[PDB]
Amino acid sequence: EQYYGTGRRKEAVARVFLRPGNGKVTVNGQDFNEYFQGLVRAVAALEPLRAVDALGRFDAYITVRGGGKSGQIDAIKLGIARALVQYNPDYRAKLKPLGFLTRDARVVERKKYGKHKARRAPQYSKR
Amino acid sequence: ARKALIEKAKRTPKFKVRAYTRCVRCGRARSVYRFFGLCRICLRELAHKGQLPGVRKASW
Amino acid sequence: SLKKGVFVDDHLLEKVLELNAKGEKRLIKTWSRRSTIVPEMVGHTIAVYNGKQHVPVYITENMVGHKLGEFAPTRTYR
Amino acid sequence: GKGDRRTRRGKIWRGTYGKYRPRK
Amino acid sequence: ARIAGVEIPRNKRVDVALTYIYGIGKARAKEALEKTGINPATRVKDLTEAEVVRLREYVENTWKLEGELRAEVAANIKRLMDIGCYRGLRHRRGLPVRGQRTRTNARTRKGPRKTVAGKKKAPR
Amino acid sequence: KIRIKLRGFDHKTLDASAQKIVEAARRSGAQVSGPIPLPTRVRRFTVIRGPFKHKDSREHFELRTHNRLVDIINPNRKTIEQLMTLDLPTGVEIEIKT
Amino acid sequence: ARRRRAEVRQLQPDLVYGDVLVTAFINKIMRDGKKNLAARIFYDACKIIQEKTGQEPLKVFKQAVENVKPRMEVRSRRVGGANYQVPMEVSPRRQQSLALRWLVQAANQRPERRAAVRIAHELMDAAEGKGGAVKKKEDVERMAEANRAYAHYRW
RNA sequence: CCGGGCACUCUAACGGGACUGCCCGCGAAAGCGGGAGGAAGGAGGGGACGACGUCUGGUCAGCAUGGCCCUUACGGCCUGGGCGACACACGUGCUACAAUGCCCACUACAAAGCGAUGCCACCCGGCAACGGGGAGCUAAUCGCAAAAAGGUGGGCCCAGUUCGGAUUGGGGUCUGCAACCCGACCCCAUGAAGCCGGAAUCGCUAGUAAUCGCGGAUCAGCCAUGCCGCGGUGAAUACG
Ligand SMILES: [Mg+2]
Ligand SMILES: [Mg+2]
Ligand SMILES: [Mg+2]
Ligand SMILES: [Mg+2]
Ligand SMILES: [Mg+2]
Ligand SMILES: [Mg+2]
Ligand SMILES: [Mg+2]
Ligand SMILES: [Mg+2]
Ligand SMILES: [Mg+2]
Ligand SMILES: [Mg+2]
Ligand SMILES: [Mg+2]
Ligand SMILES: [Mg+2]
Numbered sequence: 001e002q003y004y005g006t007g008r009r010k011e012a013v014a015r016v017f018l019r020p021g022n023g024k025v026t027v028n029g030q031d032f033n034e035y036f037q038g039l040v041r042a043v044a045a046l047e048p049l050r051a052v053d054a055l056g057r058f059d060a061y062i063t064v065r066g067g068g069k070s071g072q073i074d075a076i077k078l079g080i081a082r083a084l085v086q087y088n089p090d091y092r093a094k095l096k097p098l099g100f101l102t103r104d105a106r107v108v109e110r111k112k113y114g115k116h117k118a119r120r121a122p123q124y125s126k127r
Numbered sequence: 128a129r130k131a132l133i134e135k136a137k138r139t140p141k142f143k144v145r146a147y148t149r150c151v152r153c154g155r156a157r158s159v160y161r162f163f164g165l166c167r168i169c170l171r172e173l174a175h176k177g178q179l180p181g182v183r184k185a186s187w
Numbered sequence: 188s189l190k191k192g193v194f195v196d197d198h199l200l201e202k203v204l205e206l207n208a209k210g211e212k213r214l215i216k217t218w219s220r221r222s223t224i225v226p227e228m229v230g231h232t233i234a235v236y237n238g239k240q241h242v243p244v245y246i247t248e249n250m251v252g253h254k255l256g257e258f259a260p261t262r263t264y265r
Numbered sequence: 266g267k268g269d270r271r272t273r274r275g276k277i278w279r280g281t282y283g284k285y286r287p288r289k
Numbered sequence: 290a291r292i293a294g295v296e297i298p299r300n301k302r303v304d305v306a307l308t309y310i311y312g313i314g315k316a317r318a319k320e321a322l323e324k325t326g327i328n329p330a331t332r333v334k335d336l337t338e339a340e341v342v343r344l345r346e347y348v349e350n351t352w353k354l355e356g357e358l359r360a361e362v363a364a365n366i367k368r369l370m371d372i373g374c375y376r377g378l379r380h381r382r383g384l385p386v387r388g389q390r391t392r393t394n395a396r397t398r399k400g401p402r403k404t405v406a407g408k409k410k411a412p413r
Numbered sequence: 414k415i416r417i418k419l420r421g422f423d424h425k426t427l428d429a430s431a432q433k434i435v436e437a438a439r440r441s442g443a444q445v446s447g448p449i450p451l452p453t454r455v456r457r458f459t460v461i462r463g464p465f466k467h468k469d470s471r472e473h474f475e476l477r478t479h480n481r482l483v484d485i486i487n488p489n490r491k492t493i494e495q496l497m498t499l500d501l502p503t504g505v506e507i508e509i510k511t
Numbered sequence: 512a513r514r515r516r517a518e519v520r521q522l523q524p525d526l527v528y529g530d531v532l533v534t535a536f537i538n539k540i541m542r543d544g545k546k547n548l549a550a551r552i553f554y555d556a557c558k559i560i561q562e563k564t565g566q567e568p569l570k571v572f573k574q575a576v577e578n579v580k581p582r583m584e585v586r587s588r589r590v591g592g593a594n595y596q597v598p599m600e601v602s603p604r605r606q607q608s609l610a611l612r613w614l615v616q617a618a619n620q621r622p623e624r625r626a627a628v629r630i631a632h633e634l635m636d637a638a639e640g641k642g643g644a645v646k647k648k649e650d651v652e653r654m655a656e657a658n659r660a661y662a663h664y665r666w
Numbered sequence: 667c668c669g670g671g672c673a674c675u676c677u678a679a680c681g682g683g684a685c686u687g688c689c690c691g692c693g694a695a696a697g698c699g700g701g702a703g704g705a706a707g708g709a710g711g712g713g714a715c716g717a718c719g720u721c722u723g724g725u726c727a728g729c730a731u732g733g734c735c736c737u738u739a740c741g742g743c744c745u746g747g748g749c750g751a752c753a754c755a756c757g758u759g760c761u762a763c764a765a766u767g768c769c770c771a772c773u774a775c776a777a778a779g780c781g782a783u784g785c786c787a788c789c790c791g792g793c794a795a796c797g798g799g800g801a802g803c804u805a806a807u808c809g810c811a812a813a814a815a816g817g818u819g820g821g822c823c824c825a826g827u828u829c830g831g832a833u834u835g836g837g838g839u840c841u842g843c844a845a846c847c848c849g850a851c852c853c854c855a856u857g858a859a860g861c862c863g864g865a866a867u868c869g870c871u872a873g874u875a876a877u878c879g880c881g882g883a884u885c886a887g888c889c890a891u892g893c894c895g896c897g898g899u900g901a902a903u904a905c906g
């Protein structure tokens with residue numbers, strides 16, 4: 001019945017659900033290709049299914065919260081993987097080989113005092 | 128003139144406008160806090176001793 | 188900018204109003220460069236303070252919604 | 266630009282609201 | 290078409306056109322459409338002969354509109370000259386006038402940076 | 414029905430003092446909702462180390478205000494004796510409602 | 512850096528044509544971290560390839576690139592009395608970088624009002640073999656060889 | 667939203683984890699390069715942490731403090747002025763010179779903080795700043811609140827322009843006894859220099875630079891474009 005994976009990527013938590021059937025995709029109450037209209041990176045989150053090859057099979061029901069639309073697309077791209085990895089003891093041959101598993105620890109770092117932007121150091125006179 | 132001031136500050140009779148702050152420990156008018164009641168100088172000092180409840184060398 | 192009042196200090200009109208009595212002399216000093224000019228207060232040259240001395244400034248209708256301060260120069264070398 | 270009061274941005278940058286950026 | 294004084298915008302849309310008049314900004318522009326009645330997207334080249342009139346009428350008639358406008362402006366400043374109120378001067382001395390830092394900037398009311406100069410420090 | 418708050422500072426104590434009010438709230442009758450740790454409100458403030466002029470290398474502190482909630486389902490005259498008289502907060506603070 | 516040899520950052524394949532050599536470009540096209548605008552332009556440019564040419568977009572871009580990778584450039588050097596400009600080989604790594612770069616710059620240097628069109632046409636010319644890049648490549652070429660004298664400083 | 671449910675998410679408190687223990691290569695060792703499993707290796711990536719001493723460094727104006735000096739004043743109060751002066755030079759900054767743009771209507775994705783004569787929903791008045799009413803909050807359970815860039819479609823058309831908002835005139839609002847010197851917003855009208863900056867020179871090696879919006883302290887109000895923080899989008903390059 002339900003197939004879930006914890007979608008999380010840079011202050012973005014996505015809830016992935018996979019129901020066999022058509023292929024319809026939903027997020028926080030909207031059609032995938034509608035909630036992400038404009039973002040040419042949208043069709044990237046579904047890329048995991050496109051290599052398992054098994055797209056026309058899971059009516060995925062997601063709900064991502066927190067972060068940025070793109071960040072969300074990342075959280076999702078991990079859920080769609082973490083979710084279906086569960087219901088396929090053999091589908092491990094992709095989440096490890098085709099690097100689809102990493103929280104991307106890559107995240108914004110604290111702004112140190114005396115550095116306009118956590119690193120960009122102020123100007124300089126000397127004279 | 129920093130003695131007569133601490134007192135002058137305490138008194139308040141005139142227009143609430145002029146009612147201004149000033150460090151509790153040291154007679155300092157600049158960089159005080161609506162909390163602690165201490166000045167940056169003072170605060171950090173006490174802070175290091177521990178006499179400032181729940182206050183801890185921040186870390187994140 | 189005052190739209191309900193006129194913040195024009197009282198020890199002025201007080202001394203201006205009593206002077207309004209048949210209208211006598213005029214020489215009158217003050218430190219209210221912060222108050223406003225009152226209509227009909229023309230002819231009442233009011234020396235205003237600036238921090239140094241009192242500028243013997245005449246006062247006429249041309250100037251009214253102004254402050255006696257605008258009329259007193261605070262700094263030197265204008 | 267962020268410097269024109271009579272503009273959505275300008276008003277925003279200034280942290281204000283008004284005829285060019287009303288409160289809904 | 291000469292709508293005002295001696296001003297005539299061209300081959301553009303009226304909403305932008307009028308702008309080219311002293312006294313008429315973007316505001317008063319659309320302010321003469323709720324009372325005039327015309328579709329802004331229209332170029333000044335093509336448009337009913339009457340529209341121009343009903344336009345010019347409103348515009349010129351309503352308020353006041355280059356010269357004399359531009360002329361009143363002076364007077365005020367002239368008036369500021371009176372006995373010499375503070376804000377009155379500054380215009381007199383050609384300095385900024387709403388309290389700013391003449392020390393550094395203010396080059397907009399100040400004359401080109403008339404350099405001239407100054408201090409020297411002993412080498413030995 | 415009766416609600417109880419738990420602020421304070423050292424989450425080392427507050428945790429215990431709170432936890433106590435359950436192992437002792439069950440023995441007094443009605444069941445209870447396990448010590449729930451709600452979010453922490455924090456007080457951060459920076460200061461310029463030097464007492465003069467050194468806007469850099471300054472130093473800021475924190476003041477973690479831990480909160481903690483727990484609640485009894487049914488108000489037994491039993492529990493009352495305990496809670497009301499078992500006031501044992503070293504540096505803790507507790508608010509109670511309904 | 513003096514320490515390590517430094518390893519090349521890898522890129523994520525395109526979403527439309529799926530090719531790093533593409534993303535690379537889009538990136539170079541991107542100004543102020545705004546990819547959506549960076550990609551569109553690029554693609555919108557291809558949507559203006561079929562018209563100006565019944566060619567497969569992917570191949571024009573691919574060619575344009577090849578038509579600019581500078582076989583060789585000159586890099587300064589100090590010795591004494593004056594500085595000789597030594598001419599030497601160029602690994603694809605830098606070639607691609609250069610080529611790609613020149614493309615974008617050249618584009619924006621064009622007089623086409625829209626951006627799509629610029630990258631667009633620019634791509635075509637290059638692809639063909641006569642674009643600002645082509646020139647900026649040729650120039651670099653000229654520079655070298657001519658300085659073959661000092662070439663014996665390959666270092 | 668109601669009943670109801672801890673599975674998610676999360677909040678916050680306690681644990682396991684990674685130790686060169688495995689394999690190959692080099693060696694006397696320590697230990698280097700390669701590889702698998704793994705979320706993560708060989709200090710995993712950031713914080714806190716800065717030796718003996720150095721600059722007769724800084725600060726007697728935060729405080730403490732030896733010596734010196736003043737006492738109807740070198741002490742104290744007060745109203746007014748000043749620290750905001752301006753022919754000029756520099757430092758750091760902010761907004762820009764535009765179509766990878768600007769404007770306008772609509773529609774989304776944050777994090778981190780903050781709040782008692784305090785933040786204000788929601789109404790009615792006003793073009794608006796804001797003002798009369800008035801619900802909720804002792805605040806993961808109400809408010810500040812809107813993220814902006816983005817996405818949609820609509821308007822400009824390469825022009826000092828619908829680029830850019832300085833300057834000034836007129837009309838207002840709010841805090842405060844009080845905005846002349848000297849506050850910040852608002853609206854109308856003005857639309858300045860600037861079409862990318864000499865000699866020079868700065869920052870940054872990845873979630874960094876660049877770019878966009880947000881919180882807080884101080885604080886009636888505010889000259890904050892500052893500072894201290896948060897998050898969104900998200901690169902180029904490193905032969906040597
Ligand atoms: Mg950032
Ligand atoms: Mg410095
Ligand atoms: Mg004194
Ligand atoms: Mg005050
Ligand atoms: Mg503009
Ligand atoms: Mg020589
Ligand atoms: Mg390379
Ligand atoms: Mg050996
Ligand atoms: Mg560490
Ligand atoms: Mg010294
Ligand atoms: Mg002392
Ligand atoms: Mg005074």
Ligand SMILES: [Mg+2]
Pocket residue numbers: none
């Ligand atoms: Mg003053």
Ligand SMILES: [Mg+2]
Pocket residue numbers: none
């Ligand atoms: Mg100063």
Ligand SMILES: [Mg+2]
Pocket residue numbers: 388389390391750
């Ligand atoms: Mg000034």
Ligand SMILES: [Mg+2]
Pocket residue numbers: 774
């Ligand atoms: Mg929304």
Ligand SMILES: [Mg+2]
Pocket residue numbers: 778779881896
């Ligand atoms: Mg915050």
Ligand SMILES: [Mg+2]
Pocket residue numbers: none
């Ligand atoms: Mg919060």
Ligand SMILES: [Mg+2]
Pocket residue numbers: 789
């Ligand atoms: Mg209503």
Ligand SMILES: [Mg+2]
Pocket residue numbers: none
């Ligand atoms: Mg009220």
Ligand SMILES: [Mg+2]
Pocket residue numbers: none
């Ligand atoms: Mg009210």
Ligand SMILES: [Mg+2]
Pocket residue numbers: none
């Ligand atoms: Mg202005």
Ligand SMILES: [Mg+2]
Pocket residue numbers: 862
């Ligand atoms: Mg430049």
Ligand SMILES: [Mg+2]
Pocket residue numbers: none
């Ligand atoms: Mg140049």
Ligand SMILES: [Mg+2]
Pocket residue numbers: none
């Ligand atoms: Mg040079």
Ligand SMILES: [Mg+2]
Pocket residue numbers: 871
């Ligand atoms: Mg670095």
Ligand SMILES: [Mg+2]
Pocket residue numbers: none
């Ligand atoms: Mg801010």
Ligand SMILES: [Mg+2]
Pocket residue numbers: 885
């Ligand atoms: Mg404030």
